[PDB]
């Protein structure tokens, strides 16, 4: 979009189901097609949220059970029991 000066500076966050689509959210990316998710510019800049990282959290929950509680109390805003 254009305004009176362009919409490329508008901060947006896009929910994504497939990781491989993240490189479609960036125009001036020199990333190779085989670049992993965490090295792409949209992920590194925080303009794209891939839900698959939640699937990682389960594993991170298995080796340490306090990580989920810390994330919940940092993220949800302090939801007491």
Which residue number, 18 or 69, has a Cβ lying nearer to another protein? 18
Torsion of Cα atoms, 25 then 30 then 35 then 41, to 10°: -50
CB of 23 to another protein, least distance (A): 6
Which residue number, 6 or 76, has a Cβ lying nearer to another protein? 6
Phi, psi of 70 (to 5 degrees): -65, -45
What is the x/- site pattern for another protein, positions 34-53, by CB under 8 A? x-------------------
Which residue number, 24 or 38, has a Cβ lying nearer to another protein? 24
Phi, psi of 16 (to 5 degrees): -125, 140
Angle at CA 52, nearest 5°, toward 47 and 54?
Answer: 95
What is the binding site for another protein (CB under 8 A)?
20-21, 23-24, 27-28, 33-34
């Amino acid at each position: 979009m254009q305004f009176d000066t362009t919409g490329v500076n508008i901060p947006i966050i896009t929910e994504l189901v497939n990781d491989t689509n993240v490189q479609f959210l960036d125009q001036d990316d020199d990333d190779d097609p085989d670049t992993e998710l965490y090295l792409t510019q949209p992920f590194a800049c925080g303009t794209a949220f891939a839900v698959s990282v939640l699937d990682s959290l389960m594993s991170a929950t298995y080796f340490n059970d306090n990580i989920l509680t810390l994330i919940r109390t940092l993220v949800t805003g302090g939801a007491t029991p």
